[PDB]
Design a protein around this ligand. Structure first.
Ligand SMILES: Nc1nc2c(ncn2[C@@H]2O[C@H](COP(=O)(O)OP(=O)(O)OP(O)(O)=S)[C@@H](O)[C@H]2O)c(=O)[nH]1
Ligand SMILES: [Mg+2]
Length: 316
């Protein structure tokens, strides 16, 4: 048996790694399982367009076309259905027209100023597909869903003849007090960091930079004497979102002394060193760092293969 524990701040990608284990090692989500996620996809979609519409009020952004005001009204009249797992053609049309509005887009592109699901664009750009009658979520749709984890999720799978018990816990501040319930008999910790968090603030506190919060947690876990003999794996996750963001959002928002360019390789490396430097015992404790896109099954497959071999060599 191998006990793996996923840790990291909220929305760092822990629960998405869990889903990937089912897809990679257990033949994925069945049709009945996918259908269970349909209301989650619909809920994520409605909540995302609504969050942008709410932000337009706060930031004082007009619709590009005045005709959208009536669509916005109809959005709330019709939203109830999607919350129950149904999306009518009329609702889809309302959301589609809203999503294409230049005012809504302006607000979308300022999402760091409020709280918006990372998968907002993914679902909203695929409205024609997901609004289909008899729509059944794909594996990617399932991977892209967002539900805050409360309590402790335990998943089992077999890989390279090892029986893995993977534990997943909530990362938001309210759930941190529960991490200690998972601390016994841990073979390895996979600590997830959202690379794209560098310019965001906490949903639970708008004065706290998300990445600074991540750093504090990693510092605490990595250097905890309880975990001296526990393999510490660092997933610098959301590399796909990071690659896009680094082009246009300065890393100095997070790290004032960053002197490199607005490019993926230099900035990614700099963030890696910031986290690895928190290790107070560099000669006696190794950190196994990987850059990941948790929603990308192929990337996770190869990364997780490499991680597993490390775990086999070091703990078994
Ligand atoms: N584009 C992209 N999206 C990702 C990536 N990793 C996770 N996500 C998405 O981000 C959202 C949050 O991921 P999730 O797995 O729920 O984080 P969590 O760490 O479990 O969050 P919590 O339970 O502590 S609140 C999900 O919608 C998920 O699909 C990634 O690498 N790239
Ligand atoms: Mg989770």
């Amino acid at each position: 048996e191998v006990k793996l524990l996923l840790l990291g701040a909220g929305e760092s990608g822990k629960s998405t790694i869990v889903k990937q284990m089912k897809i990679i090692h257990e033949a994925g989500y069945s049709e009945e399982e996918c259908k269970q996620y349909k209301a989650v996809v619909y809920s994520n979609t409605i909540q995302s367009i609504i969050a942008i519409i709410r932000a337009m009020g706060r930031l004082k952004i007009d619709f590009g076309d005045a005709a959208r005001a009536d669509d916005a009204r109809q959005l709330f009249v019709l939203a109830g259905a999607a919350e129950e797992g149904f999306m009518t053609a009329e609702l889809a049309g309302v959301i589609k027209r809203l999503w294409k509005d230049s005012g809504v887009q302006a607000c979308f592109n300022r999402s760091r100023e409020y709280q918006l699901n990372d998968s907002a664009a993914y679902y909203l750009n695929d409205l024609d597909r997901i609004a289909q009658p008899n729509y059944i979520p794909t594996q990617q749709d399932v991977l892209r869903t967002r539900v805050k984890t409360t309590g402790i999720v335990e998943t089992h799978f077999t890989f390279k003849d090892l029986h893995f018990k993977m534990f997943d816990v909530g990362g938001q501040r309210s759930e941190r007090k529960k991490w200690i319930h998972c601390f016994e008999g841990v073979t390895a910790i996979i600590f997830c960091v959202a690379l794209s968090d560098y310019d965001l603030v906490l949903a639970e506190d708008e004065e706290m930079n998300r990445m600074h919060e991540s750093m504090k947690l990693f510092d605490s876990i990595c250097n905890n004497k309880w975990f001296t003999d526990t393999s510490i794996i660092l997933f610098l996750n959301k590399k796909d979102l990071f690659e896009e963001k680094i082009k246009k959002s300065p890393l100095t928002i997070c790290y004032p002394e960053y002197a490199g360019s607005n490019t993926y390789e230099e900035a990614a490396a700099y963030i890696q060193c910031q986290f690895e430097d928190l290790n107070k015992r560099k000669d006696t404790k190794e950190i196994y760092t990987h850059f990941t896109c948790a929603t990308d099954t192929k990337n996770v497959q190869f990364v997780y293969d490499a991680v597993t071999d490390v775990i086999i060599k070091n703990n078994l």
